[PDB]
Amino acid sequence: SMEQVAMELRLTELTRLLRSVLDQLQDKDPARIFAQPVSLKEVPDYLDHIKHPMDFATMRKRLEAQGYKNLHEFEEDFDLIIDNCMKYNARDTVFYRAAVRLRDQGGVVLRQARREVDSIG
User: Fold this and answer.
1) Is 113:17 a contact under the CB 8 Å cutoff?
2) How many domains is the chain built from?
3) E strand or H helix at 110, and its extent?
4) Distances from the Cα of 16 to the Cα of 36, 54, 94, 106, angstroms
């Protein structure tokens, strides 16, 4: 139907917007601590600690499959990155400190993306 196509064009435009947001969020991780999933070869117990792992490549795969219906779903995944890291790693580590910074720097980017999604419908 024509209704299904219009739905599809909106999903494609959301996807376009989220891709730019993702690139902006990932620039706030210049050390690439969150680029890829935590390695299970190198941290074999990781799943006993973290029940829902997340990373920027896994978010990128979901994105390009148009797997995000709205900004809320995308934000849940971003927040998992941060939140997983702050549980698994102690406060006086480079990893925890980098999550704190990605969180603080991301919130600006996310504050405006919420307005653009609401605005552009």
Assistant:
1) yes
2) 1
3) helix 94-120
4) 22, 21, 32, 18
* Alpha-carbon gap, residue 30 to 15, rounded angstroms: 23
Burial class (CB in 10 A: 0-12, 13-18, 19+), 104: exposed
The DSSP letter of residue 51 is S
Experiment used for this model: X-ray
The domain that contains 63 carries what CATH number?
A: 1.20.920.10
Structure tokens at 59: 């978010």
DSSP 8-state secondary structure symbol assigned to residue 113? H
Report yes or no: 96 and 76 within 8 Å, Cβ to Cβ: no
- Resolution rounded to one decimal, in angstroms: 2.2
Is the separation of the CB atoms in 109 and 23 below 8 Å?
no
Q: For the purposes of burial, counting CB atoms within 10 Å of the CB of 111, is it exposed (0-12), middle (13-18) or buried (19 or more)? A: exposed
